[PDB]
């Protein structure tokens, strides 16, 4: 029977090792994710700025097209 309480020692020791390993992997796994996340927010930020420039250029066109529409009109006298 001692030979059973002996397996339980090793078995429990082995499980701990694995558990330890599991936490060690969670660490980088979650570290990688944090980097991907920042990178995303960052990318999302600058892309957001690109959109702003896009919208503004859309407002530019809308205004400018006013002189264009006027100029055209002034051409048909």
């Amino acid at each position: 029977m001692r030979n059973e309480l002996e397996e339980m020692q090793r078995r429990a020791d082995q499980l701990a090792d694995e558990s330890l390993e599991s936490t060690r992997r969670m660490l980088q796994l979650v570290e990688e994710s944090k980097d991907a996340g920042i990178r995303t927010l960052v990318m999302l930020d600058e892309q957001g700025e690109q959109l702003d420039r896009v919208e503004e250029g859309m407002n530019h066109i809308n205004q400018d097209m006013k002189e264009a529409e006027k100029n055209l009109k002034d051409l048909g006298k």
Binding site: S22, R53, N71
Partner: protein
């Protein structure tokens, strides 16, 4: 009385269960990252097409203007 093994086995189950989740979550972040990075490619394409369009409209205006002026 090594019920202690029972606990260790339970804790272990809990810990790997968490690692699996942290796994879904980890990939989840990798996907978003690659998704918006990819979308950036679609946004700057939109950026240049609009920059161009603005240039063309501006030009169009001053040409239509010079047209009107050349009428006299």
């Amino acid at each position: 009385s090594k019920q202690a093994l029972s606990e260790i086995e339970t804790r272990h189950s809990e810990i790997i269960k968490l690692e699996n989740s942290i796994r879904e979550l980890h990939d989840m972040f990798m996907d978003m990252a690659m998704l918006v990075e990819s979308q950036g490619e679609m946004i700057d394409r939109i950026e240049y097409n609009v920059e161009h369009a603005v240039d063309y409209v501006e030009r169009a205006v001053s040409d239509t203007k010079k047209a009107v002026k050349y009428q006299s």
